């Protein structure tokens, strides 16, 4: 990206909830270009959200995310001395990239042996707010602040 | 690993067979390591070429199945 | 998978046929 | 170490094959070998004529062999004499009775293989390389060409270090496909090692 500012690739909306955000999440789950099994897991997880809580799987998922989006993070920057971690505010595109990313990663660490379960519980756990997905989120907010001394660089 | 014949050099047996009608020879020497050993053609001592020289190998029963080059190795320091 | 000759996928990959992958 | 054959590049436009015979997948191999041994024979024992191209067509024992030259008379003699021997000399080993057309070239200073060939000849005659190049281009530029270029390889003037002396005028756009660029390549078996002569002559478009 030396030349342009890269047009954010626009996503084909969901075949169910008609939501672009959903699909995005489904992709992050996908492995070797197996979108089918990917979407099976996410949907067959939405099923687990019902059998356990009253709420619509979407509004679970949706608000589960917003709890995993970080507001600040640290990006390195050296000088004529050493490398320092300036805490930086985090732009809306990156927030989504990171939450969704983190969600799945966090999920596949869980114990239950079946993809659909893990996605579900983690989503559920992160809607409540007790997820290990949300740990990787509080940890960065905390890893800023700790470097609050350096937020006078910012570039 | 074959099953119609045993593919042993014919010029070998002629020596062996016609050495097997009262024949006691030990100076028997060959380059036919490609040739299968054959039933109870024992007792004899075939020197086999390893690529550099001939090897005085005495033939027993038990080794009847194997080929002749399995006893004249072609290298050094194993 | 692709290196166990006695699996169907080991045969497919090896490109051969037999007990564990017969041709119809 | 770059730069394609400007001819090989053009086949399908601008330049057409010197062998227009369809064959099949176990005969092609042979109608190839013959086809070639033909030109190995012509080119040896017909050099003096000055042969540019050697078209060849086939169709089950009729073979076109249209020999293009600047001085046809040396394939002939006065009446028949020689060409009579050669339509024989062809069919001599080629177990087929051959045809044998003959063509002239309205200008041998537009025949790249000749322009290159002449330049070579000068070089075994211990000539002034720099001039030969500059002459050759000048001749060809005056036979009405739109642009033209000549290269020699190295050991120029019997020297110890291999060089590469070159020259050109007008357009010689090797990157245009609609270019029509005769290319020709001569040797030069000198007393101290080989030289190498590329020749380029560009004509036109649409």
């Amino acid at each position: 990206a030396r030349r342009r500012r890269a047009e954010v690739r626009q996503l084909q909306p969901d075949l169910v909830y008609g939501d672009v955000l959903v699909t995005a999440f489904i992709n992050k789950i996908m492995r070797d270009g197996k979108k089918n099994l990917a979407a099976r897991i996410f949907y067959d997880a939405c099923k687990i959200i019902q059998e356990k809580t009253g709420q619509e799987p979407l509004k679970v998922f949706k608000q589960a995310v917003e709890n995993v989006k970080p507001r600040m993070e640290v990006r390195s920057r050296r000088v004529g001395g050493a490398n320092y971690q300036v805490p930086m505010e985090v732009s809306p595109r990156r927030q989504q990239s990171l939450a969704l990313r983190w969600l799945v990663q966090a999920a596949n660490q869980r114990p239950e042996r079946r993809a659909a379960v893990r996605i579900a519980h983690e989503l559920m756990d992160a809607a409540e707010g007790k997820g290990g997905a949300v740990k990787k989120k509080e940890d960065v907010e905390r890893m800023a602040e700790a470097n609050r001394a350096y937020a006078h660089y910012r570039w | 690993s074959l099953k119609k014949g045993v593919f042993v050099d014919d010029h070998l047996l002629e020596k062996v067979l016609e050495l097997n009608a009262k024949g006691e020879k030990r100076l028997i020497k060959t380059w036919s390591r490609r040739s299968t050993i054959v039933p109870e053609m024992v007792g004899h001592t075939i020197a086999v070429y390893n690529g550099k020289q001939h090897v005085p190998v005495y033939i027993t029963e038990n080794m009847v199945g194997h080929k002749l080059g399995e006893f004249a190795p072609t290298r050094t320091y194993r | 998978g692709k290196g166990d000759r006695r699996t169907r996928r080991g045969k497919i990959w090896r490109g051969t046929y037999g007990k564990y992958r017969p041709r119809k | 170490g770059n730069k394609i054959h400007p001819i090989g590049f053009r086949l399908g436009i601008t330049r057409d094959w010197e062998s227009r015979w369809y064959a099949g997948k176990k005969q092609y191999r042979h109608l190839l070998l013959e086809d070639q041994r033909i030109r190995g024979l012509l080119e040896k024992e017909l050099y003096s004529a000055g042969l540019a191209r050697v078209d060849i067509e086939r169709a089950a024992d009729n073979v076109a062999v249209t020999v293009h030259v600047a001085k046809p008379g040396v394939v002939i003699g006065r009446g028949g004499e020689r060409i009579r021997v050669l339509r024989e000399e062809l069919a001599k080993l080629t177990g087929k009775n051959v045809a044998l057309n003959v063509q002239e070239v309205q200008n041998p200073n537009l025949s790249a293989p000749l322009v290159a060939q002449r330049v070579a000849e000068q070089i075994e005659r211990r000539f002034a390389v720099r001039r030969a190049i500059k002459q050759a281009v000048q001749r060809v530029m005056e036979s009405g060409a739109k642009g033209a270029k000549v290269i020699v390889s190295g050991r120029i003037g019997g020297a110890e270090q291999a060089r590469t002396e070159w020259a050109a005028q007008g357009r010689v756009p090797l990157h245009t496909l609609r270019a029509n660029i005769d290319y020709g390549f001569a040797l030069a078996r000198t007393t101290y090692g080989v030289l190498g002569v590329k020749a380029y002559i560009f004509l036109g478009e649409v």
């Binding site: 075949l15 979108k35 089918n36 979407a39 | - | - | -």
Partner: protein, 127 residues
């Protein structure tokens, strides 16, 4: 009585014949959901109808060859649009915003020599 369009996508081609009535859709001597059975994105193929409210007030006999299932799905999707605007040419200036009328040029790009796989380049080592 009948309307038609040609759908294609990634070496996959769809003869698409439309009729009014009922709601059934034939594909290669099979029902839709037996051919695209348990393949989540199939229903996409009929979002043309769902746009113009043609919904299932149409029947469609569709043969299709070339590709693999999910290419065909987008191919059919193109036939459905290229057919129903050939029924009502006023059914165009509403399928523009969704763009259901574009071949989608994306196909397997060529494997190049000296790579591995088109763009995938073989592995460096330096020392």
């Amino acid at each position: 009585e009948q309307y038609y369009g040609t759908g294609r996508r990634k070496e996959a081609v769809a003869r698409v014949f439309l009729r009014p009535g009922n709601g059934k859709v034939t594909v290669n001597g099979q029902d839709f959901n037996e051919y695209f059975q348990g393949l989540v994105r199939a229903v996409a193929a009929l979002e043309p109808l769902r746009a113009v409210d043609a919904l299932g007030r149409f029947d469609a006999y569709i043969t299709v060859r070339g590709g693999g299932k999910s290419g065909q799905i987008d191919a059919i999707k193109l036939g459905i649009a290229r057919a129903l605007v050939q029924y009502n040419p006023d059914y165009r200036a509403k399928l523009k915003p969704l763009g259901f009328l574009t071949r989608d040029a994306r196909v397997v790009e060529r494997k190049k020599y000296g790579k591995h796989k088109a763009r995938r380049a073989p592995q460096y080592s330096k020392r």
